[PDB]
Amino acid sequence: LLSDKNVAIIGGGPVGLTMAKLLQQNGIDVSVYERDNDREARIFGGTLDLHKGSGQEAMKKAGLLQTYYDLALPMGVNIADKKGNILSTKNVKPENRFDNPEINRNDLRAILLNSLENDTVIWDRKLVMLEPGKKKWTLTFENKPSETADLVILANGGMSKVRKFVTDTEVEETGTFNIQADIHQPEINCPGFFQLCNGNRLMASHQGNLLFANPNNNGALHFGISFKTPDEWKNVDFQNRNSVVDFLLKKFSDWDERYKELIHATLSFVGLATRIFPLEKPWKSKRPLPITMIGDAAHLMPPFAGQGVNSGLVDALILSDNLADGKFNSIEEAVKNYEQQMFIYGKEAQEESTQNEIEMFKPDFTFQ
Ligand SMILES: Cc1cc2nc3c(=O)[nH]c(=O)nc-3n(C[C@H](O)[C@H](O)[C@H](O)COP(=O)(O)OP(=O)(O)OC[C@H]3O[C@@H](n4cnc5c(N)ncnc54)[C@H](O)[C@@H]3O)c2cc1C
Ligand SMILES: C[NH+](C)c1cc(NC(=O)CNC(C)(C)C)c(O)c2c1C[C@H]1C[C@H]3[C@H]([NH+](C)C)C(O)=C(C(N)=O)C(=O)[C@@]3(O)C(O)=C1C2=O
């Protein structure tokens, strides 16, 4: 049941892009309105791990899991100390190398983009407004023609602004803060640090600061530093490089000389506060027209527990099915049901993520 109409996915993330396929597979008419300028736009951020059981189910259900195993690269993980000592190393074992192999965010999108029918994604669409008209929604896009649709699936990330028709819940900051960079030609530009990783992820922890790194994101080193947000911040300048460098050289003064090599080797740092979009209040029972929310727009959550795209790919799988079912009658109950299941696990995940982030920053911890 439920055909003859069309869908509008605002946001071509990993999650929305997946969602376009699972609908377009079962013959539903979808469009993905994405704000990026063109497909070849560089995606900042590290590597996704799709878990067997959640993320991977979604890639399976679309016929892409082998394509995901093809492009993803399984990684082992070291754990180091401020002095550079390897304390542990779980390398990849031949059977469970298919557990969560790291795939690059652009690689993933290229896979999802091939799966979709041509012109499924209309690019240069920054959705600014939603008016719920007659039998459908009017969607307005900055300096581009408006369009209309029966169902609007919100996939536009943790800081989506058009949530109000679903919930008046708003994102909160978490209390921790994350700095991130890329380093190109890591082998020569951060030679000491690249070696300490030995082709493996690298996770350190000292006195409330946390460093993470991936030595191989298509030949780029991506590292990330996390800390309880300095109290002095409320309501540095990440545009000014050696201003972020000095902050970091203070915070990381006691660490080995090799990590400092990383910091003075990165050109541009990007600042991010950790945020949560809590599943506290049940979303509105009263909704003018059919609308729902998957991905980081549904449950933005701290990036410290492997959740985020997996919850998002799952809630893609779940919702997508509820629509393609003749096992449903009313779309209002077809999404009410997707929203039932996600409140369960998102909360489960948010609890984990919020929990893990309490765990670190608290005096020297062991890792997972
Ligand atoms: C430091 C860090 C590390 C993380 N690590 C992991 C990890 O290791 N594993 C994991 O599973 N998750 C991780 N996450 C979380 C993860 O990136 C998200 O859960 C994931 O990106 C999925 O969200 P979307 O794809 O659901 O949202 P997004 O990735 O945020 O994609 C949103 C899309 O919609 C577009 N868009 C945004 N606004 C608009 C608009 N107004 N109109 C139209 N389009 C719009 C965007 O441009 C983009 O294409 C991490 C996050 C951070 C900050
Ligand atoms: C507890 N912390 C340490 C943690 C835990 C898990 N796993 C679990 O919580 C599940 N617990 C089990 C193991 C099932 C018992 C985790 O799965 C993770 C993480 C940490 C993040 C670190 C991220 C990092 N960024 C933020 C700087 C990074 O460099 C990368 C990367 N590949 O480049 C990440 O992808 C990162 O986001 C990431 O994946 C983390 C975890 O996967």
Swiss-Prot record:
SUPFAM superfamilies: FAD/NAD(P)-binding domain (SSF51905)
Protein residues bound to FAD: 14-15, 33-36, 49, 105, 127, 296, 306-309
Cofactor annotation remark: Binds 1 FAD per subunit, which helps bind the antibiotic substrate.
Predominant localisation class: cytoplasm
Reaction equation(s) it catalyzes: a tetracycline + NADPH + O2 + H(+) = an 11a-hydroxytetracycline + NADP(+) + H2O; tetracycline + NADPH + O2 + H(+) = 11a-hydroxytetracycline + NADP(+) + H2O; tigecycline + NADPH + O2 + H(+) = 11a-hydroxytigecycline + NADP(+) + H2O; oxytetracycline + NADPH + O2 + H(+) = 11a-hydroxy-oxytetracycline + NADP(+) + H2O
Activity regulation (record text): Anhydrotetracycline, a poor substrate, prevents tetracycline degradation in vitro.
Reported impact of residue 223 to Y: E.coli is more resistant to MCN, decreased affinity for MCN, slightly decreased affinity for NADPH, increased growth rate in E.coli
UniProt: NADPH binding residues: 42
UniProt note: pH dependence: Optimum pH is 8.5.
Additional free-text comment from the UniProt record: Encoded in a conjugative transposon. Immediately upstream of this gene is an N-terminally truncated tetX1 gene that is inactive. Tetracycline antibiotics bind to the ribosomal acceptor site (A-site), preventing binding of the aminoacyl-tRNA to the A-site. The hydrophilic side of tetracycline makes many hydrogen-bonding interactions with oxygen atoms of the ribosome's phosphate backbone.
Domain note: Consists of an N-terminal FAD-binding domain with a Rossman fold and a C-terminal substrate-binding domain.
Family stated for the protein in its record: Belongs to the aromatic-ring hydroxylase family. TetX subfamily.
Protein name: Flavin-dependent monooxygenase
Lineage of producing organism: Bacteria, Pseudomonadati, Bacteroidota, Bacteroidia, Bacteroidales
Gene that specifies this protein: tetX2
